[PDB]
């Protein structure tokens, strides 16, 4: 865990509860990732919650992040935010 990848990792992209910032974080596991978009975002806090970007899912779990596809969008939200849908307008 302090050094080293078990195999290739997969990209996966990044958005914070404003759904307007877009970072392509790639890792090989799930909390590989989580660890590595709090860096990404340099995230003042590291008390975090990982989730889909499509309906707001917390993905918790290895079996499920190793199911997701390439380029996953995903949403991150501090100790007092929930997930969000896509925005009908930007103004």
Known sequence: ???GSSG???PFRVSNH???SRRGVMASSLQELISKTLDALVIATGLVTLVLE???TV???EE???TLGD???FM???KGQKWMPSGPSSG
């Open 8 to 10: 290739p990792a997969r």
């Open 59 to 61: 993905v918790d779990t």
């Open 71 to 73: 380029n996953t969008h």
């Open 18 to 20: 404003d759904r307007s």
């Open 76 to 78: 991150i939200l501090e």
């Open 1 to 3: 865990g302090s050094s």
């Open 54 to 56: 499509e309906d707001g």
């Open 64 to 66: 499920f992040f190793q």
